[PDB]
Design a protein around this ligand. Structure first.
Ligand SMILES: *[C@@H]1O[C@H](CO)[C@@H](O[C@@H]2O[C@H](CO)[C@@H](O[C@@H]3O[C@H](CO)[C@@H](O)[C@H](O[C@H]4O[C@H](CO)[C@@H](O)[C@H](O)[C@@H]4O)[C@@H]3O)[C@H](O)[C@H]2NC(C)=O)[C@H](O)[C@H]1NC(C)=O
Ligand SMILES: *[C@@H]1O[C@H](CO)[C@@H](O[C@@H]2O[C@H](CO)[C@@H](O[C@@H]3O[C@H](CO)[C@@H](O)[C@H](O[C@H]4O[C@H](CO)[C@@H](O)[C@H](O)[C@@H]4O)[C@@H]3O)[C@H](O)[C@H]2NC(C)=O)[C@H](O)[C@H]1NC(C)=O
Ligand SMILES: *[C@@H]1O[C@H](CO)[C@@H](O[C@@H]2O[C@H](CO)[C@@H](O)[C@H](O)[C@H]2NC(C)=O)[C@H](O)[C@H]1NC(C)=O
Ligand SMILES: *[C@@H]1O[C@H](CO)[C@@H](O[C@@H]2O[C@H](CO)[C@@H](O)[C@H](O)[C@H]2NC(C)=O)[C@H](O)[C@H]1NC(C)=O
Ligand SMILES: *[C@@H]1O[C@H](CO)[C@@H](O[C@@H]2O[C@H](CO)[C@@H](O)[C@H](O)[C@H]2NC(C)=O)[C@H](O)[C@H]1NC(C)=O
Ligand SMILES: *[C@@H]1O[C@H](CO)[C@@H](O[C@@H]2O[C@H](CO)[C@@H](O)[C@H](O)[C@H]2NC(C)=O)[C@H](O)[C@H]1NC(C)=O
Ligand SMILES: *[C@@H]1O[C@H](CO)[C@@H](O[C@@H]2O[C@H](CO)[C@@H](O)[C@H](O)[C@H]2NC(C)=O)[C@H](O)[C@H]1NC(C)=O
Ligand SMILES: *[C@@H]1O[C@H](CO)[C@@H](O[C@@H]2O[C@H](CO)[C@@H](O)[C@H](O)[C@H]2NC(C)=O)[C@H](O)[C@H]1NC(C)=O
Ligand SMILES: *[C@@H]1O[C@H](CO)[C@@H](O)[C@H](O)[C@H]1NC(C)=O
Ligand SMILES: *[C@@H]1O[C@H](CO)[C@@H](O)[C@H](O)[C@H]1NC(C)=O
Ligand SMILES: *[C@@H]1O[C@H](CO)[C@@H](O)[C@H](O)[C@H]1NC(C)=O
Ligand SMILES: *[C@@H]1O[C@H](CO)[C@@H](O)[C@H](O)[C@H]1NC(C)=O
Ligand SMILES: *[C@@H]1O[C@H](CO)[C@@H](O)[C@H](O)[C@H]1NC(C)=O
Ligand SMILES: *[C@@H]1O[C@H](CO)[C@@H](O)[C@H](O)[C@H]1NC(C)=O
Ligand code: MET
Ligand code: MET
Ligand SMILES: [Ca+2]
Ligand SMILES: [Ca+2]
Ligand SMILES: [Cl-]
Ligand SMILES: [Cl-]
Ligand SMILES: [Zn+2]
Ligand SMILES: [Zn+2]
Ligand SMILES: [Zn+2]
Ligand SMILES: [Zn+2]
Lengths: 687, 687
């Protein structure tokens, strides 16, 4: 049973595995990450799984040129380079050995050496550009943009800059966002030093996976697009820097003053918007020589065969590739997965099997655009869509030590509330209290009443293909602090020591998280009726419908003129509530001795998330197919509800042809209404 | 059991129902067809079904203007109309009563009155236009095209004419194609009189359904495209005529002689290609005033709930709407469906239920582009794709009286061979012999060896959405003669008397067909393991792969230059064969006492057709999603195998950018190979 499973999980095994996984860098596509793959594969076998395989793919990756390093320069009239930015981050104490740490770069930047004047765009959010262009009437065309990291996915920033006519992008971490007051810089604290730099890809894939093979696995015989038809590549060069190098670049900024104080970081500089310097005269020059190449990646797939329903899959998955040492990201998740596998393997060895099949994945190349999970899901989509019960993600276990953070489909709200009521809180001052209780006090639902906050699923991690493309119920859970990161995210300072010393000295937060993740998986794979409560969907659908309705009501005149009615959507949401209620009654009232009836009802529960998928996808985003959730078009990290209606409404006042625009709003209402009604009807009696 | 079911079917009930259904016209959208819907609905209830509902939709239909009739004219220099074509067909004896028979028209023609010179284009097939433009260097731009009916779907003809720059199309039936030697014209024989005219729609929908709501049911709150963005509407006017009116128009043809004798019909005319008349001087003028309007349609859906697996659907479906009386098309099918329902209802009343759910449909508006079946499938696609076991079509039972004609998925080859070995042949001179035996002697497989021909499924009937869009295993069966029609197809002369006197005086062919259709449905809904043999798919996949390979090999030089390899496809087809064999062994070797294992294996058998669906669809045809079969792009009535590779190869010598063209061939090989491999893997052990 479950306590057995949970009792078997040890804090000290997790620490042990974390140490093992973080001694050398495990960059996607490198030999070291292949070797770590083989090791996971051997150990998952010893741990007892029925089978363990590697699945490989040849996918587009991106690397700096070793012999021609990227950097930024200030140049004078004579094109002399007065100031150059760092070529690497100062490595942390004890790691001068590090054979090779990849230098900071933006993965997938095109090559180039543009020069021009700087304009400062705050976070380079859509509203930031609105403010700049609309109110301040500044123009970025032909400019080099400098933006700080934070708020939104960096690929969104680069896309907004391209849209604004920019010719290059410089990204940096501002201490306002990455330096927590009263804490010391690494190695004496968990703060980001001025030499530290955030790596990460800057693609706008919208779910496509490998840029060359959208729709299909990048296997041996795959036909590949030419790089010119590749999906999601930026067309301007981009490069990231620390705040020391950034202060040099910002200290001379001329033109307009920040429009207000929210545009201002913590550096001792004016934060002028520019364009140009105060040093007329001087310009900025980028040197990007990174290359894209087709490189092989390896996922590790382990299988624990179910005893009763082997053709039903519960999936625990998390990535193994890291920018450098991956102390937090991803090895604090991977080490938790490893102990969960060891622990399932133990039960199995004593003769136990779960009811359903459990699949365990160690994904590759997440950092480069969720490529390993996606290609694998493109290859197995027929199995996943007919047999996939649920997907639990397992990136970083901790990103703070304050409370539980859970994002999932409403189908799993009750499972997560129940499970956490049986778990001991590991928080100071809640000893003897349940996880549900510390979590509820520290993180109260706005939505009401005496319940914890649970968020929507956006994207930016490996659950994306499972939920947004395939409609498989998905969740994730981690410890967090009281979309920007923790200060040391994706830098060289993310090490084993960072975690042992400052985050989780006892590894008790890792353990709590291993219980939540492992317990969810255990319940999903073994409970006789699937632990999904469809009435939870009925509740949030109503809230989401009120929400998009209020957004539309900011335009009463247009609603009148174009006859924009939400009646069909509320009507669909009403029918969903009613039918969902009745389906629950039947769920309570039928006999579990009849297997066929049990399988039927489970199939209904399983396909219910699947019912929300539109095979045509959302407009311009063919691989985002879920009609209720999609990643925000302004922020890949954030979920948006009724994404098709929301985007039809967004900035509608600016559209040239109002009735065409409002026509499209109404089309999206219709699509949403029909999909909600069709989903509800899957829960009707079947004949 | 099955004999019980079959013994219950009577020839005389079928005749009785056929008579009842053919006394007045039942045009889609008219009150008479609503009334016939209500009657079917009452009678399916009395017959015993658990429930019977009407599902309605508001869809684009098309009608002639009653007070401004369509016709064609010959005009002189002074624009005088010398010759006008008929305004209606002479009604058959006894039907001068007929309140109103719609006059011949091409459904969905735009309005217009173009004048110009005639060019004669034979069947207006793609090769016909190749011959005309390429070899004869004739130019149709600005011309009015005249084509004879036959060979290919009429909508393809109109699209080829548009592509060729034509400004109007005149369609007619040539006695070469619609007058069988030695037989008399109706009412004294089954031949087409010179006054008879073939109705039918001329859309190019490619699976979209209702032109205004592609993707989604045309329900009450549906958002509808503007007619200018409608799917599949021709942009030139089109009108059909009999061979009397056609002889007048053809007798004066000038320009070139027919390129050869295959261009020549049976009329006593030269069959000159034109352009223009021999009467310089005279021109042709079209008068089309037909309108398109959104009109309500009604499907009747009956349900016979399964005893053991109510959430598994076997579907028997056929249309009810007719151009006029529908003596053959569709009421000879509808009357067979009615007797099958009555017969299932009888068993049910004596306490029996099938194992799986059976759904019975009477579709509306088939004649106007398969609209009723399609809209219903767009509305229920989530149920159909997870629960749909099989779809059996039921249009016309007879179109000849020579032998059985069966088209179906390879998954049903064995079911159809077995079932027909248990059925008595109704053919003269095979009394005491089995249906399999007359059918095999009269219609031998080319493919080998001692087996009957079974054809590929294309489109042009209501199975289209189920098979080509949704991937549900589909079949159809009918009596045929020794893509053009029978002579009286879609004319006013298609009556009850036509069938009683000349086709099936005893109704014994209707009865055989009711046994084949009802027996297939019975086996599918009741057999414990689904009666599909996946090794039949392995066999035809190999044949199809040889076939497309030979087509490519006509271009050895390009295959060399571009490195076009079919190795991945043959490799996929090999793995399919191997895995299919092993899956059959397990299928034989497992115990039917374990229900869960039985359901698992049945689910594999059920989803196997589903595995061949690509959610991106085929290029430019988003609603054709099956990778192995699609309707021919040159002939909606015909199936093409590996449609994506075939179309990439078709007329490739003519493409401007060879490596781009050959690139696309290779892409399609890759897609085909991967889909075959993914389908095979669904039949692997599941964990
Ligand atoms: C939520 O579930 C309910 C059912 O429980 C479902 O209600 C349905 O609403 C539709 C659309 O309003 C109803 O449609 C009617 O059908 C009857 C025949 O049964 C027709 O006579 C009506 O048509 C006339 O009136 C229309 C509206 O003014 C005219 O436009 C039309 O031209 C006709 O003159 C009408 O179409 C349907 O009957 C009910 N079904 C019921 C009550 O069982 C509702 O649609 C669901 N919500 C969603 C979004 O699906
Ligand atoms: C039909 O089923 C068979 C399996 O039963 C399946 O065979 C697979 O073929 C692939 C592709 O050829 C094999 O891929 C190899 O994998 C190994 C590692 O296991 C690699 O070392 C190999 O890569 C090297 O060689 C390549 C080819 O020259 C180089 O391009 C590459 O850069 C490497 O140097 C190679 O990728 C795979 O191992 C087998 N699997 C087996 C035999 O189990 C076949 O693909 C199926 N058919 C289809 C169309 O799917
Ligand atoms: C991580 O732990 C693994 C497994 O214990 C270590 O790999 C084993 O170590 C020795 C080499 O000294 C070999 O005898 C085994 O073959 C290895 N087992 C494998 C690959 O599964 C590995 O050395 C550890 N890594 C670190 C950095 O300590
Ligand atoms: C920034 O780096 C550049 C590139 O290395 C330095 O300029 C180079 O310096 C060498 C030695 O003076 C010259 O031979 C090259 O011509 C220069 N290269 C280019 C492309 O300008 C420059 O010194 C650095 N700037 C500072 C302030 O250190
Ligand atoms: C979470 O736990 C609650 C409370 O135990 C469960 O709700 C009960 O479930 C049982 C078993 O079917 C019913 O008999 C009770 O009537 C339910 N009580 C309530 C308050 O609804 C709920 O099912 C659990 N959710 C899960 C386990 O997914
Ligand atoms: C087709 O058969 C039906 C059913 O027997 C006939 O409809 C019935 O006829 C009488 C009207 O004379 C009524 O008492 C019943 O209400 C009808 N039943 C229905 C509608 O289910 C119908 O008249 C026949 N049609 C023809 C042309 O003979
Ligand atoms: C073909 O039909 C046209 C249309 O009815 C006939 O021409 C019309 O005839 C009436 C009476 O002569 C005239 O008043 C109209 O002006 C004509 N209409 C048009 C549009 O031309 C014509 O007679 C018919 N041709 C033949 C040979 O019967
Ligand atoms: C068609 O009938 C053939 C011959 O009876 C069936 O094949 C046999 O099926 C039985 C039952 O599983 C096996 O034990 C035999 O070994 C099979 N014989 C052969 C020749 O294969 C076949 O299964 C039937 N196809 C159907 C009913 O779908
Ligand atoms: C890296 O830089 C060298 C020159 O310094 C260049 O010639 C080489 O091609 C580069 N490597 C690439 C582009 O992969
Ligand atoms: C922005 O400035 C550039 C300067 O070259 C100009 O080409 C472009 O049209 C301007 N656009 C706006 C938003 O005014
Ligand atoms: C963990 O422990 C305490 C709890 O308040 C906190 O003050 C400290 O900052 C935490 N460590 C990190 C890395 O947040
Ligand atoms: C039919 O023709 C009349 C005139 O004869 C026209 O005015 C009317 O609008 C037409 N009906 C239509 C177009 O539906
Ligand atoms: C066909 O003839 C028309 C005459 O107007 C001309 O415009 C068109 O370019 C010609 N095309 C070909 C195929 O020569
Ligand atoms: C039906 O019966 C005989 C069989 O040869 C045939 O000659 C006759 O033409 C058939 N009727 C039709 C309509 O084909
Ligand atoms: C490429 S989607 C997100 C990848 C990675 N988790 C990042 O946030 O940088
Ligand atoms: C619109 S697809 C075919 C419709 C009808 N069966 C015809 O052949 O005319
Ligand atoms: Ca791919
Ligand atoms: Ca539609
Ligand atoms: Cl996570
Ligand atoms: Cl048919
Ligand atoms: Zn990560
Ligand atoms: Zn990361
Ligand atoms: Zn028909
Ligand atoms: Zn027809």
């Amino acid at each position: 049973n479950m306590k057995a499973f949970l009792d078997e999980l040890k804090a000290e095994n997790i620490k042990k595995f974390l140490y093992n996984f973080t001694q050398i860098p495990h960059l996607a596509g490198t030999e070291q990450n292949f070797q770590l793959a083989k090791q996971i594969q051997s150990q998952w076998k010893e741990f007892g799984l029925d089978s363990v395989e590697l699945a490989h793919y040849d996918v587009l990756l991106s690397y700096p040129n070793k012999t021609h390093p990227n950097y930024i320069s200030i140049i004078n009239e004579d094109g002399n380079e007065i100031f150059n930015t760092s070529l690497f981050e100062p490595p942390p104490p004890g790691y001068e050995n590090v054979s090779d740490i990849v230098p900071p770069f933006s993965a997938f930047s095109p090559q180039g050496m543009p020069e021009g004047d700087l304009v400062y765009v705050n976070y380079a959010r859509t509203e930031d550009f609105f403010k700049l262009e609309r109110d301040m009437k500044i123009n970025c065309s032909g400019k080099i943009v400098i933006a700080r990291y934070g708020k939104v996915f960096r690929g969104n920033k680069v896309k907004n800059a391209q849209l604004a006519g920019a010719k290059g992008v410089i990204l940096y971490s501002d201490p306002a966002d990455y330096f927590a007051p009263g804490v010391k810089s690494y190695p004496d604290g968990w703060n980001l030093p001025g030499g530290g730099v955030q790596r990460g890809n800057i693609l706008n894939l919208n779910g496509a996976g490998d840029p060359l093979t959208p729709g299909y696995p990048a296997n041996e015989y795959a036909y590949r697009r030419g790089i010119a038809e590749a999906v999601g590549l930026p067309s301007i060069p981009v490069h990231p820097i620390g705040y020391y190098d950034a202060q040099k670049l910002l200290e001379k900024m001329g033109g307009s003053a920040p429009p207000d104080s929210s545009w201002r970081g913590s550096l001792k500089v004016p934060y002028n918007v520019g364009p140009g310097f105060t040093f007329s005269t001087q310009k900025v020059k980028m040197h990007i020589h990174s290359t894209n190449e087709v490189t092989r990646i390896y996922n590790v797939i382990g299988t624990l065969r179910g005893a009763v329903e082997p053709d039903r899959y519960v999936i625990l998955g998390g990535h193994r590739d890291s920018w450098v040492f991956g102390g937090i990201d991803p090895q604090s998740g991977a080490a938790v997965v490893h102990e969960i596998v060891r622990s399932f393997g133990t039960l199995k060895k004593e003769g136990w099997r779960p009811r359903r099949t459990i699949l365990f994945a160690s994904w590759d190349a997440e950092e480069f655009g969720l490529l390993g999970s996606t290609e694998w899901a493109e290859e197995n989509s027929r199995l996943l869509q007919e047999r996939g019960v649920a997907y639990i993600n397992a990136d970083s276990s901790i990103e703070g030590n304050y409370t539980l953070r859970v994002d999932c489909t409403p189908l799993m709200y009750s499972l997560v509330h129940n499970l956490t009521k049986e778990l001991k809180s590991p928080d100071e001052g809640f000893e003897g209290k349940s996880l549900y209780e510390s979590w509820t006090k520290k993180s109260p639902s706005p939505e009401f009443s005496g319940m914890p906050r649970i968020s929507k699923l956006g994207s930016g991690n490996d659950f994306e293909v499972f939920f947004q493309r395939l409609g498989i119920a998905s969740g994730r859970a981690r410890y967090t602090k009281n979309f920007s990161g923790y200060p040391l995210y994706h830098s060289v300072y993310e090490t084993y020591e960072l975690v042992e010393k400052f985050y989780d000295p006892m590894f008790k937060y890792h353990l709590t998280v291993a219980q939540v993740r492992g317990g969810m998986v255990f319940e999903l794979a073994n409970s006789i009726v699937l632990p999904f409560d469809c009435r939870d969907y009925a509740v949030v659908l109503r809230k989401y419908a009120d929400k998009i309705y209020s957004i539309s009501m900011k335009h009463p005149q247009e609603m009148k003129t174009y006859s924009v009615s939400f009646d069909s959507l509320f009507s669909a949401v009403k029918n969903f509530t009613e039918i969902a209620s009745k389906f629950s009654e039947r769920l309570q009232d039928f006999d579990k001795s009849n297997p066929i009836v049990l399988r039927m009802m489970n199939d209904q529960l399983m396909f219910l998330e699947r019912a929300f998928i539109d095979p045509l996808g959302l407009p311009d985003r063919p691989f985002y197919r879920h009609v209720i959730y999609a990643p925000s078009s302004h922020n890949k990290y954030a979920g948006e509800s009724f994404p098709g209606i929301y985007d039809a409404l967004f900035d509608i006042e600016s559209k040239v042809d109002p009735s065409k625009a409002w026509g499209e709003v109404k089309r999206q209402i219709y699509v949403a209404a029909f999909t909600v009604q069709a989903a509800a009807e899957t829960l009707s009696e079947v004949a």
